[PDB]
Design an enzyme around this catalytic site. Structure first.
Site, mmCIF file in Angstrom:
data_model
loop_
_atom_site.group_PDB
_atom_site.id
_atom_site.type_symbol
_atom_site.label_atom_id
_atom_site.label_comp_id
_atom_site.label_asym_id
_atom_site.label_seq_id
_atom_site.Cartn_x
_atom_site.Cartn_y
_atom_site.Cartn_z
ATOM 1 N N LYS A 179 -6.187 -0.990 -0.406
ATOM 2 C CA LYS A 179 -5.777 -0.175 -1.577
ATOM 3 C C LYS A 179 -6.687 0.496 -2.533
ATOM 4 O O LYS A 179 -7.880 0.769 -2.524
ATOM 5 C CB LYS A 179 -5.097 -0.961 -2.537
ATOM 6 N N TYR A 180 -6.129 2.700 -2.055
ATOM 7 C CA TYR A 180 -6.787 3.512 -3.175
ATOM 8 C C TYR A 180 -6.107 3.581 -4.490
ATOM 9 O O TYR A 180 -7.973 3.687 -4.746
ATOM 10 C CB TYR A 180 -6.022 4.668 -1.761
#
Lengths: 244, 147, 490
Positions: free
Chosen positions: C1-2
DNA sequence: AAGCAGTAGAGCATGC
DNA sequence: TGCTCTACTGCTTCGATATCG
DNA sequence: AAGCAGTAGAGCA
DNA sequence: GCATGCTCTACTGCTTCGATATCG
């Protein structure tokens, strides 16, 4: 434009050294000027900013209310101007020191990070100093031993370390200086490699196809029984189309 | 049965935990939107428009208060897009409560930042001035400053 | 996930013995733990300032939580690092800080059990963001909290099994009761000492992984390959200087306009044109024409044949070199061709040449694409990316020229003496660690007004050389190395 | 560039 | 008359400003 | 918006 | 055979953060 300085190695190896600039990202020297309609002129235009405390219904303030506040985590702190004028950072004038040297060729091809590259060259006026630097570089040229110079321009300038590559040629004997990163500019993250793949394996007919590709799309050719390379298309002499 | 959730919404905001006030306000404003449009007896509709419109407490002062925040966005948005169904459950009988709504929406536009809620203020003003046509009731609103 | 984040619960032991001075007079492990906690918060306030943090003391007399079990008292909720929360955590130093802890809670009880792991789990089960790492750094000393009854230990290891069911990773910092590996007790079916790293190797950094561009490369006109163009020398500097209104500690958010044709009023940006002036004649344009004349190509990369790796000299560069890599998001299955082309480029040493237009509207620049292969060993030593590197080449007015009229000779005696000097001054270059002087003194100077300890800590310079440590490494060959073949003598 | 939500042209089941 | 100041000056450095993906 | 060294016009002479 | 009750997923748009050309 001529640049004079004094190189130092250790305590007192102060040799007066001249230097010139080289390849730089060239830019234009003319400003687009704002002109209103119906006038074909500029001087009848006042472009300005207004200092307007909104936050609310507005109360328009003046310029002497301004604390140059900075961010810290989840709050905003003062120390506007004269406090950082007190506790700023100095590095006492210009300097061209040598940190050390390195016989390893582990300064790789991909960490250069510079908006300009320098030629420390010689001096003038009965150049025994420059023949001493000629002796220096005629010693340094035989092996992969480079120099890590600390450079600054003035007290306004910032300090920067970098590589001093040797350059022995026919007419000129140069040392060429490029900057280097600090351990705040590197970042390094994990990638999925492709050599040990279960879906992305190319087969041999496709391998021979791309081999035929890289054969038949080349540009360099060798001839005249001496095997020095003849290559056309020099993307260092081709002019840039933009300003043209 | 109302004004219980009104004073609950009015008093639940002053302390900390500015997500609990948001969820409670969402629940209670949903309760008001359920329990005021359903009624139809016209004197009791007048009772409701005299209950939610008080000069000390109510929705207008509650949305006047906590605009210096960022956590009361969903509830304020529900309020400002609920008032364009409350201006269409009733009509020109709201005319002596109009200029306060105009000033409310004008400050809410020129004071906020996010256009998740800045557009519905212009929605209430563009519904209201479309309704209340060019009459005596256009001299309260200083058009010479609004333009 | 960013935009995902990582939490951290710091669990501190205080029942009987960690508050003890170990019958010594150097330092207590309790204040050592508070040293470590305050240093990791003073690091992650500027290094990674969006992680989620929490600190929980267990075993004491009182208890304030959300579940109301004994001997469990928290001070901070899972949140960003707050400078007020560290200005209230710094008061627990010294004898008077120990006294302050003693008169706000004291310590000592029949302390916790599985239930402190329970309150850690219910601390994790509440915050609504995205989670990637979930680590517990426990600060405790003893190696049997179940020193009298076996049901405590059985339910503790069953509760640790249920916490490893969802996988919450705990790994303590054992204190130095023997100074190392002697007390190897049965604290091993729970988890799957070194503290100077946490004390000072985290000074000022940043962490991010984006992509910066997602373009396509065209070989002929119909070979489209989707690439992403990452940057790996970010060239960072300081956060921006916000403006502040004087007294009430508020921002300003200023405006701007243009008017005054000596009549007053207000002019819109619709009636505005651009111009250039030579002496008397002025060439007038519209802004659409000004942004129109910098249009030469589409956004993308264009192949222009191949080159061998012999002519592109490392004297030539103008840009921080980027990095490119194929992604299977736009065009399906293009990493197969990329892996084949990678294999034949590393087998036949060849490197491509291309024309570059990164954004949707820009004049072109010629780039060269150079192959690159990974390095690895058993410790997951991933140090080099597999792919292509982009070296940037100048065009016309960059390479200037010197006056060129200088050439003198030398004589081969100084080569061995200079070899002696460079071998006195020899070192392997680095792997890291040449940290920034201006940024380090700036962040410590900000820290000085942040926590108001006493003063600016003078951040030690590192770019300067140790002049005495090269004087004595050299010796007394300096004067002969001056005047062996070149005496100045005025 | 990532991501985050919410509208809305576009169809199905139904009434007069 | 040559040296010694002296206001200017090209030219450079970050710095706040503006644009975009 | 700031500095640094080069380069033609005054002042004591 | 025309005007309503009822689902529906692709499109577009705003926010957040980061990167680069610009006048001074």
């Amino acid at each position: 434009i001529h640049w004079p300085c004094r190189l130092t190695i250790g305590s007192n190896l102060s040799i007066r050294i001249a230097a010139y600039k080289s390849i730089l990202q060239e830019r234009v020297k003319k400003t687009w000027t704002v002109v209103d309609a119906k006038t074909l002129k500029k001087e009848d235009i006042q472009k300005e900013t207004v200092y307007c405390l909104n936050d609310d219904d507005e109360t328009e303030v003046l310029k002497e209310d301004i604390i140059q506040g900075f961010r810290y985590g989840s709050d905003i702190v003062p120390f506007s101007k004269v406090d950082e004028e007190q506790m700023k950072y100095k590095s006492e004038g210009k300097c061209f020191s040598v940190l050390g040297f390195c016989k390893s060729s582990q300064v790789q091809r991909r960490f250069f990070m510079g908006n300009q590259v320098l030629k420390v060259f010689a001096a003038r006026d009965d150049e025994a100093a420059a023949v001493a630097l000629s002796s220096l570089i005629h010693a340094l040229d035989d092996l992969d031993m480079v120099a890590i110079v600390r450079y600054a321009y003035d007290k306004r300038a910032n300090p920067q370390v970098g590589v001093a590559f040797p350059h022995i040629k026919h007419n000129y004997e140069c040392l060429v200086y490029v900057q280097l990163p600090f351990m705040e500019d590197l970042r390094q993250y994990m990638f999925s490699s492709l050599k040990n793949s279960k879906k992305y394996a190319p087969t041999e007919a496709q391998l021979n196809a791309v081999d035929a590709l890289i054969d038949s799309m080349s540009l360099a050719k060798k001839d005249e029984k001496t095997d020095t390379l003849e290559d056309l298309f020099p993307t260092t002499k081709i002019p840039n189309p933009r300003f043209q | 049965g109302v004004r219980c959730s009104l004073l609950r919404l009015q008093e639940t905001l002053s302390a900390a935990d500015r997500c609990g006030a948001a969820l409670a306000g969402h629940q209670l404003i949903r309760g008001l939107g359920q329990e005021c449009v359903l009624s139809s007896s016209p004197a009791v509709l007048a009772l409701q428009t005299s209950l939610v419109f008080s000069r000390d407490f109510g929705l207008l002062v509650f949305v006047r208060k906590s605009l210096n925040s960022i956590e009361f966005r969903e509830c304020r948005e529900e309020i400002l897009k609920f008032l364009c169904i409350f201006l269409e459950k009733m009509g020109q009988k709201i005319a002596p409560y109009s200029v306060e709504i105009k000033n409310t929406c004008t400050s809410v536009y020129t004071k906020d930042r996010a256009a998740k809620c800045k557009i519905p203020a212009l929605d209430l003003l563009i519904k209201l001035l479309q309704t209340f046509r060019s009459s005596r009731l256009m001299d309260e609103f200083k058009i010479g400053e609004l333009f | 996930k960013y935009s995902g984040r990582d939490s951290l619960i710091f669990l501190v032991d205080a029942s009987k013995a960690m508050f003890e001075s170990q019958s010594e007079d150097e330092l207590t492990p309790f204040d050592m733990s508070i040293q470590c906690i305050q240093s990791v918060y003073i690091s992650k306030i500027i290094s990674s300032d969006r992680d989620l943090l929490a600190v929980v003391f267990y075993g004491t007399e009182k208890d304030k939580n959300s579940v109301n079990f004994k001997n469990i008292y928290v001070l901070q909720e899972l949140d960003n690092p707050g400078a007020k929360r560290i200005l209230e955590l710094d008061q627990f130093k010294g004898q008077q800080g120990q006294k302050r802890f003693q008169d706000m809670m004291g310590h000592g009880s029949d302390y916790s059990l599985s239930e402190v792991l329970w309150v850690c789990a219910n601390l994790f089960s509440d915050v609504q963001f995205k989670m990637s790492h979930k680590r517990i750094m426990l600060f405790t000393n003893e190696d049997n909290p179940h020193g009298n009854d076996s049901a405590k230990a059985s339910r503790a290891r069953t509760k640790a099994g249920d916490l490893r069911d969802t996988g919450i990773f705990l790994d303590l910092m054992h204190l130095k009761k023997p100074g190392g590996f002697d007390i190897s007790l049965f604290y091993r079916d729970i988890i799957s000492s070194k503290l100077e790293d946490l004390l000072r190797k985290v000074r000022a950094k940043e962490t991010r992984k984006r992509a910066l561009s997602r373009l396509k490369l065209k070989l002929n006109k119909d070979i489209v390959i989707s690439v992403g163009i990452y940057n790996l020398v970010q060239k960072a500097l300081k956060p921006p200087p916000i403006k502040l209104y004087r007294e009430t500690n508020e921002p300003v958010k200023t405006k701007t306009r243009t008017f005054n044709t000596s009549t007053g009023g207000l002019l819109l940006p619709s009636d505005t044109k651009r111009s250039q002036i030579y002496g008397s004649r002025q060439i007038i344009l519209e802004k659409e024409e000004t942004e129109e004349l910098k249009r030469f190509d589409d956004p993308g990369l264009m192949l222009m044949g191949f080159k061998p790796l012999v002519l592109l000299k490392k004297h030539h560069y103008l840009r921080p070199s980027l990095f490119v890599y194929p992604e299977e998001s736009l065009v399906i299955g293009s990493s197969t061709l990329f892996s084949a082309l990678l294999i034949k480029c590393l087998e036949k040493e060849v490197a491509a040449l291309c024309r570059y237009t990164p954004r949707r509207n820009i004049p072109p620049y010629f780039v060269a694409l150079v192959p690159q292969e990974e390095e690895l060993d058993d410790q997951k030593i991933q140090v080099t990316p597999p792919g292509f590197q982009l070296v940037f080449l100048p065009f016309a007015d960059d390479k200037r020229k010197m006056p060129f009229t200088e050439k003198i000779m030398a004589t081969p005696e100084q080569v061995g003496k200079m070899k002696a000097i460079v071998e006195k001054l020899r070192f392997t270059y680095r792997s890291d660690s040449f940290e920034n002087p201006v940024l380090q003194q700036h962040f410590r100077n900000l820290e000085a007004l942040a926590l108001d300890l006493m003063e600016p800590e003078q951040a030690v310079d590192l770019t300067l050389p140790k002049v005495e440590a090269m004087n004595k490494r050299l010796g007394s060959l300096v004067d002969e190395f001056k005047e062996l073949v070149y005496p100045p003598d005025y």
